[PDB]
Amino acid sequence: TIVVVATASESAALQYLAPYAGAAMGEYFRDRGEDALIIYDDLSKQAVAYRQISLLLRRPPGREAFPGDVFYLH
Amino acid sequence: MATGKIVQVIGAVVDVEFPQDAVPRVYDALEVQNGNERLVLEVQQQLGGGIVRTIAMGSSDGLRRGLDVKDLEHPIEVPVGKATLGRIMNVLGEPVDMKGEIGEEERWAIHRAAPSYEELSNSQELLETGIKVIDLMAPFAKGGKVGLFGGAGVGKTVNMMELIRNIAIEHSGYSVFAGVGERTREGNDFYHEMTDSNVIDKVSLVYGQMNEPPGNRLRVALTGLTMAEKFRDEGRDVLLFVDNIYRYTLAGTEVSALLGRMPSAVGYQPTLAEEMGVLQERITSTKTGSITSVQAVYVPADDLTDPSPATTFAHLDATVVLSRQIASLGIYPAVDPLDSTSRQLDPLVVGQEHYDTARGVQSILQRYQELKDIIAILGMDELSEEDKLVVARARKIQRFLSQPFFVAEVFTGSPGKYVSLKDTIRGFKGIMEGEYDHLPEQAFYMVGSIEEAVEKAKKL
Amino acid sequence: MATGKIVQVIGAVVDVEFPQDAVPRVYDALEVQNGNERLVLEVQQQLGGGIVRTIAMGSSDGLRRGLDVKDLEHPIEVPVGKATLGRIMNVLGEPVDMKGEIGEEERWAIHRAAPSYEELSNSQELLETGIKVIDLMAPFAKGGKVGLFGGAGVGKTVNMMELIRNIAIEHSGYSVFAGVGERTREGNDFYHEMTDSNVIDKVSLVYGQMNEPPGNRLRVALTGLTMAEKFRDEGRDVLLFVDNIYRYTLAGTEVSALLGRMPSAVGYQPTLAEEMGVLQERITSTKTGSITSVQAVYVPADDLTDPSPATTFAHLDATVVLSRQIASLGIYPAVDPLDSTSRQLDPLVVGQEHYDTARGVQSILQRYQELKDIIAILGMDELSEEDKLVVARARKIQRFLSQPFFVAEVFTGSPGKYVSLKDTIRGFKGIMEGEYDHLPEQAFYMVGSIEEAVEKAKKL
Amino acid sequence: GVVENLASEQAARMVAMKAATDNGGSLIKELQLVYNKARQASITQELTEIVSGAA
Ligand SMILES: Nc1ncnc2c1ncn2[C@@H]1O[C@H](COP(=O)(O)OP(=O)(O)O)[C@@H](O)[C@H]1O
Ligand SMILES: Nc1ncnc2c1ncn2[C@@H]1O[C@H](COP(=O)(O)OP(=O)(O)O)[C@@H](O)[C@H]1O
C-alpha cells in the first residue's frame, strides 16, 4: 500500500488536491500494465474543502452553497 | 486575422473583449490557441460594451489573459450525412476513434428552429420492436418518443442496445446515438458490441463524456439531433437514441450556475423547461421523413416528482417503467407490465385484438397480485378451482414476457430471439385462453415465440 | 508610538488603517484606549490599503472612529506552566480571581501548529469510569478523546462533572478546565467545589463564559488548549475538560458575516471545518506526553445532522450521544446506546466477553425499536411469545442502564453509586440470558450493581 | 363452550380494532405536526439559499 495523507488541519487546497495526487500515483502503475486499487476516503470532505475555496473566491454558490462545478470536480 | 483578447478566466467561463464594431453574436464559436491545442468557445452572453461571456468547450487549463481570440462567424458546425455512419465523434464533430478525418462533404450548424405545426405529419404507423413486452404493453408510432424510466442497474442501456440491433438488422433503417453524459466504460462496451454485431455500419455515434466541461456535455444532444435532422431531410425514418436526459438537465443546471443565473425550485436552472422544449420539439415526424426517438430517464432517489422527470413527462408518448425488483427476480427485460403506458394503446389505432390481449394480460396480472396474499396466509389449497387456474395462467404470462436479447448473450451465453408482434399476440392470446395449461411454467421462461415454449416443454 | 487609526466599527469587528510600510501581520495583537480602559484587537485579515480587519477582545461600545491604536508586534500570549495551576485566567491570560499577578516565567502564543505525524502515539490502555453505560457501550482509553453530544438540558454537564469526579481526582497529573461560553454560575460552583475539596492546586481554570463578547468566546478555547499543550510538552499526562466546544464555532459564525465572507450551508462560516480541525487536531497525545480530554458538544435544535455536530463527530474517539426522549423518561444517564460508540469496542482491545455483552445489548435494543411501531398501532398483545420476551428484556435493560450519581445527589436524594466494569458486564450478561426474568422493571431503576436490584425487588 | 368462545372472539376483535383505529388517528396528528415543521424548514432553507446567493 501507499498512504496519502491530508489531515483536518491542512490548507483547504491540500485537501482539495489530495485525491488527484493519489490518482496520479495510481496511474503510474496503470499505464505500465499493472493493477492498482485507490481508496478515496471522504470525497465529501474534498467537496467541503472545494466549497470553502470557491466561497472565499466569491464564486456564485449553487445548491447547499456548493459551487456549480462540483460534478465536473468529481 | 484575430481581433479579440481574453480578459478573464474563472473556471470554464472565459470573457473576451472585442472592438466595438465586431462583437460576436450569441452562440458564435470563437477560437483560441490553448498552447498547441486549439480551443473553441461558445458565446453565451453579450454583456456590457464589447465584452463577451463564453463557455470553453475544451478544458480551460493553461489559458492566460491577453491571448488572441479569432471569432468564427458561424455557430459550432458539424459534419453530417452518410460520411458520419460508423464513426465516433465529439460535440465539435471531430473524430475520436483515431480512424483519421471524417472526410465530410457538408457542415450544418447545431442551432436551428423546430418545424412549425403546419409542417407536421399526423401518423400512426406503429414500430415493431423485437421485444414482446414493449410491443404488447407500450406500442409507439413513428415520430413518437419513448421514455425508459427506472432506477440504476435496471437495464435501460442494454434495452437501448437491443432496440438499436433489432431496428438495424431486421428493419434496415439508420440510427443515431447521442451519448450525453456518457461513461467511457459503457461507451467502449457499446462501440464493441455494435462492431461485433455487424450493426456498427448503420449507427452514427456521438459521445459527450462525463469528464468534459458542462456545456460540452450540454451541446451533444443538439449535435446528435442535427445529424438525425440531416438524415430526415433525405427521406429516411431515422431513430435517435438519447442515453440519459437526466444528465442533460444536470449539464444545463451546471452551465446555468456557472453563468451566475439565479437558481430555481430545487436549484435547477430557470430555463429548465425551455431547454427541454428546444430539445424535444425538434424530434418530430414531418411530411418528408421522421425522427423517432427513445430516451433513457434516470429517476433520482425514486420519485417522479422532482423537476427533471416531471418536466420530461410532458413530451413523451410512451413510458416504459423498469423495476429492480423484477430484475432481481431474474426476469429480463425488467418491464413492469402494469405501470407502463402509451397514448397509442386504444382500439382505434392498434385494433381490437391487440387492445383486448393487452387489457386481458393486465387484468390477469392484477388478479394474481390480489390472490398473492391469500395464497401467502391461507395456502394455495384453499383457493377456488377457477382461482387456482388464474394463478397458473398469470404465472405463465409472467414468465413468457421475459426474453433473451442478442446483446445480453455476453451476460448469459444463451442466444437471442426476435419476436414478431403477430407471434406475441398469438402467444398471450393462447395462454390466457388455456391452450397451454398442460405445459410447465419453466417452459415459458426465456423463450422466443410460443413454438419455443412447446418445444422446450417437449424437451423438459 | 500609536501608529494606526480606526476607520470602521461594525459590532465586534473593527477596521484599522496603517501606513503601508508598517501594516501588521495576520494574527498580531493591537491595543486601543477605549475611553479609559485598554482594549485588545486581534487582526484577522489584511485588506489592501494599509487597512486591517480585527476582532475586539472586549466590549466594542464607546469606540469612535479615528482613535489611535498601537501595534503590538506579537500575537496574543498567555502565561503558561506550573505558575498557572490554582488560578482562574481571562482569554488574554490575565488573572480574573482577585489574587495577585501570575508568577509565570514563560508565555506562549495561542496560535500554534499541530504535532507532526511521526510524533503521535496511540494507546489501548482502557480507562475505567464508574458509569455503567459509558464504559460498557463506549469504553475510552487513556489519552483518547471523549465527546458528549446532546441538546439542551439532557445531562452533558452533570455527566462531565461525574467524569471529573471519578477519573480526575484519583489521577496524578495536572488538569485543565476550559469554560467556553457556558454559565458563570456553574463556573463559580465548580471553582468553590474544587477549592473546598483542596484539589484546586492541580486544576488550571480558564473562563470565557456566555456573557462575554464574541472574541473572548472564540479565543478562550485556544488559550486553554495552549496550557494543556505546555503541560503535555513537559512530559506529563494531562486531563483537559472543555465545557462546550460548540460555542467556539458559534462565535465564529457570529463574526463570520461581518468579515465579509459569503454564508454557507445553514448560515455557518465557509471555514467551519477548518476552524474546527485547526483546534481539534492539536489536542492530541504524543510520544512525550498524553492529553485525555472530555468535550461537551451541544447539538442545536436536537438536530444531530446540523453541520456543526456532523463535522465534530469525525474528530472524537468515543462519542456518547444523549437524547431528550430518554431523559423525558427520567432515565439518567440519558445515553442512547444505539448511537453511542467507541474506537475501543473491539474484541482484541476490550476482550471477547465485554464485546459480546455490548453487542447483545445493542441487538435486543434495536429489535425493541423495530417492534415499537407495531406495538404503537396494534398494541402488545399481537406480538409473538418470543417478541414479548425480547421486549421485556429490552425494557429491563433500559432501566438497568440508569445509575445514580454523586453529583446528582442534590436533584434526587439517592446516594451515588460507583459500578465496576466487572459488575456491569456481569449484570447485563445476567439480564440478557433471562436469569432475572422474574423481577419487575422497577427493580432495576436507579440502582448500582444487579445485587442492588435483587434487593430493591423485595421492597417493591 | 365452542360457540360462546367464538362470539367472545368476534367481540374481542371488534374492541381491539376500535382501539387500533384510535391509535392510528393520534399518530396522524403527530406525523402531521412533524410534516408541517419539515415543509416550513424546506421553504426557508431554499429561499435563503437563493437570496444569499445573489451577491
Ligand atoms: N437482458 C439482460 N440480460 C442479462 N443481464 C442484464 C440484462 N439487462 C440488464 N442486465 C445487467 O444489468 C447491468 C447494467 O444494466 P444497464 O443497462 O447498465 O442498467 P442502467 O439502466 O442502470 O444503465 C449489466 O451489467 C447486465 O449484467
Ligand atoms: N443523574 C441525574 N439525576 C438527576 N437529574 C439529572 C441527572 N442527569 C441530568 N439530570 C438533569 O439534567 C438537568 C440539566 O443537566 P445539565 O448537565 O445542566 O444539562 P446540559 O448541561 O446538557 O444542558 C438538571 O436539572 C438535572 O437534574
Ligand SMILES: [Mg+2]
Ligand atoms: Mg445507464
Ligand SMILES: [Mg+2]
Ligand atoms: Mg447544558
